[PDB]
Write a protein that binds this DNA or RNA. Structure first.
Length: 57
RNA sequence: ACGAGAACUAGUAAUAAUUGUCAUUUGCAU
């Protein structure tokens, strides 16, 4: 049960409704979506990291 | 399988214009 720390050094747009909107934190929805899209881009197998991983916001 | 994805705060125009470094004052009393 490890935790990850994120440093950016470049400004980030995270969005709620419109591109001119700004939000500070994002939810496990967008995070899990990103992990899924990068898993598919890598061409790895998705079953393992679909129904076993629990992510906090 | 991220309220996403496309998207040059870009294009036009300058320090310009009229102004003199002048106006008087013995290389002079042996």
């Amino acid at each position: 049960t490890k935790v990850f720390k994120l440093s950016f050094k470049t400004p980030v747009h995270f969005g709620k409704k419109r591109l001119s909107d700004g939000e500070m934190t994002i939810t496990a929805d967008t995070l899990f979506s990103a992990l899924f899209i990068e898993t598919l881009q890598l061409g790895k197998d998705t079953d393992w990291l679909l129904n076993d991983l629990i992510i906090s916001d």
